Design a protein around this ligand. Structure first.
Ligand SMILES: OCc1cn(-c2ccc(Cl)cc2)nn1
Length: 185
């Protein structure tokens, strides 16, 4: 792909984070804490899952960023509507305002309803995410495998501003403590 030139500098929004997340001072890394991180509750925080949004909102144009997932067992990445549900249980689907892929139990899947099996020969250490607002496209790239395509959502009905979306996943196993990191341009 040749999307690298639409690179944008993404930072995480502390106020949206689940209360167990630890966001780095530069707002470029997030990981699961071993306890509640001593923050007040608010209507923006994801309550049920270890999720956080980017601060940036996109309503036009072409945007590209990269996320490091090295040595994680589970995570979700992509974009979502600014107005997604924050509280209670929900599925990651375009009907609920999410355009995402994930790793879970040694398989990669796209957040369609129902979910779609992905075919990845080279487990990614870094994922590239490309959004074309006008075209209604979200695409995912395997940076470890020379930028190979993972998945394209097309005919997307965004229906509002978009925010970068992150889930560091649960760490029930003790093997999923590693952070998500926004990679430099
Ligand atoms: O480290 C064990 C661990 C804790 N969590 C967890 C689950 C749900 C929420 Cl809302 C917050 C944290 N996941 N794994």
């Amino acid at each position: 792909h040749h999307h690298h030139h639409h690179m944008v500098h993404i930072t995480l929004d502390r106020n949206t984070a689940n209360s167990w997340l630890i966001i780095s001072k530069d707002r470029r890394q997030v990981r699961m804490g071993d306890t509640h991180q001593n923050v007040s509750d608010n209507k923006e925080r994801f309550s049920n899952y270890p999720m956080v949004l980017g601060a940036q909102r996109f309503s036009s144009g072409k945007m590209y960023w990269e996320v490091d997932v090295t040595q994680k067992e589970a995570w979700d990445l992509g974009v979502c509507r600014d107005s997604v549900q924050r509280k209670g249980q929900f599925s990651l689907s375009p009907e609920n305002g999410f355009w995402t892929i994930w790793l879970w139990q040694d398989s990669y899947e796209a957040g369609t309803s129902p979910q779609t099996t992905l075919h990845i020969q080279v487990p990614p250490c870094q994922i590239g995410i490309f959004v074309d607002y006008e075209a209604g496209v979200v695409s995912f790239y395997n940076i470890t495998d020379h930028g190979s395509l993972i998945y394209t959502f097309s005919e997307c009905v965004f229906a509002g501003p978009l925010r970068p979306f992150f889930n560091v996943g649960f760490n029930y196993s003790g093997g999923n403590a590693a952070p998500l990191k926004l990679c430099p341009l």
